[PDB]
């Protein structure tokens, strides 16, 4: 990987040491790339749900995943499960439980620094991954895409700046997001500007992913669309009461 130090490089050689897992899905892809698409024909908000248990920057307990997945079965486009375990509180058999009692597409959320994480994605039961463009070499993102396409899983890039997205964009990328949940550490560099700045940089063809700031103004999302936004990336925390998702997802 890339040179990384401090926090970050911690958990991706913590991730590089991550033991394999044996275990085999008891259904197939559902494609989370595709099904955007889909909600995108019928003009239905493509809202892709963040869950993590408890996280580092903001140190909370959550309620139960089976449970939320569940409940977010009905609306989402697709669940992003945190799977990391140490500052995350995730775990890979928290998402083998989410991946089998729900029939919509599962995004392993994790730092994926090599193919066995891709195959522990894959018989785990998640239909595509996170690769993070700021933390792989170009060399190591262009491998990993295709490692995970010919599981049939097409991954959802993440890029931070106008770097990444260069690096994302000329090996192929063909699902981008354009910032995560938290806003990153070099921090002024994330924000909503900076966010319609990279959008603008993005071909037609790519889906591009949006990690909303602030959910209730609809008009963050309904103008994000104006500018070929395809799904927004939203923390569960911020979507708990029904109604109010019925409200963003139309």
């Given at each position: 990987p890339r040179y990384l130090k401090g926090w970050l490089e911690d958990v991706v050689q913590l991730s590089l040491r991550r033991p394999s897992v044996h275990a085999s899905r008891q259904r197939?892809?559902?494609?989370?790339?595709?099904?955007?698409l889909e909600f995108n024909k019928s003009n239905i908000t493509a809202i892709i749900a963040y869950y993590t248990r408890k996280s580092p920057s903001g140190l909370d307990v959550e309620r139960d995943p089976i449970e939320y997945?569940?409940?977010?079965?009905?609306?989402?486009?697709?669940?992003?499960?945190?799977?990391?375990?140490?500052?995350?509180?995730?775990?890979?058999?928290?998402?083998?439980?989410?991946?089998?009692?729900?029939?919509?597409?599962?995004?392993?959320?994790?730092?994926?620094?090599?193919?066995?994480?891709?195959d522990d994605a894959y018989n785990l039961g998640a239909d595509t991954v996170l690769?993070?463009?700021?933390?792989?070499?170009?060399?190591?993102?262009?491998?990993?895409?295709?490692?995970?396409?010919?599981?049939?899983?097409?991954?959802?890039?993440?890029?931070?700046?106008?770097?990444?997205?260069?690096?994302?964009?000329?090996?192929?990328?063909?699902?981008?997001?354009?910032?995560?949940?938290?806003?990153s550490k070099s921090s002024y560099s994330i924000n909503k500007e900076n966010q319609r700045k990279l959008i603008s940089m993005i071909p037609s063809n790519v889906v591009k992913v949006a990690a909303t700031f602030k959910v209730s103004e609809r008009n963050e999302i309904e103008e994000l669309r104006k500018l070929g936004v395809n799904a927004f990336l939203i923390s569960s925390s911020l979507m708990r009461n029904p109604e109010k998702i019925k409200e963003l997802i139309e």
């Open positions: 197939p892809i559902i494609s989370l790339n595709e099904r955007i997945a569940k409940f977010m079965e009905r609306y989402a486009v697709g669940l992003s499960i945190k799977t990391e375990e140490k500052y995350f509180n995730g775990s890979y058999e928290m998402l083998r439980k989410i991946a089998s009692s729900v029939s919509i597409p599962i995004l392993m959320n994790d730092f994926i620094v090599k193919e066995s994480q891709i690769l993070i463009a700021s933390i792989l070499t170009e060399r190591e993102l262009e491998s990993l895409l295709e490692y995970a396409r010919s599981y049939g899983m097409e991954p959802l890039i993440l890029i931070n700046d106008e770097n990444d997205l260069d690096i994302a964009l000329r090996i192929g990328a063909r699902f981008i997001s354009i910032f995560s949940v938290d806003k």
